[PDB]
Symmetry: C2
């Protein structure tokens, strides 16, 4: 039997300096790092695609 | 005594369909036509220039 070593799961920091593992939970808890004021979306497609 | 005609001041539109002659007063009163969410300002220059 060969021993399986462990590499600890890294944590990615988020807003306010709060570090979590999953992207989803960190984003839904503390929010993203930098504040962009919004997204001015541009859409290139048909009218049905735009709808 | 030559006749001097008058041409009526043209009104520039603003937010909510409110027309005012002065761009400054119309902007302060009603605001721009479209709502960009913010300005992601970028500055190239010296540190004194940044300050």
């Amino acid at each position: 039997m060969k021993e399986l070593i462990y590499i600890e799961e890294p944590s990615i920091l988020f807003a306010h300096g709060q570090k979590c593992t999953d992207p989803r939970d960190g984003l839904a808890l503390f929010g993203p790092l930098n504040q962009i004021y919004g997204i001015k979306s541009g859409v290139v497609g048909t009218q049905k695609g735009l709808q």
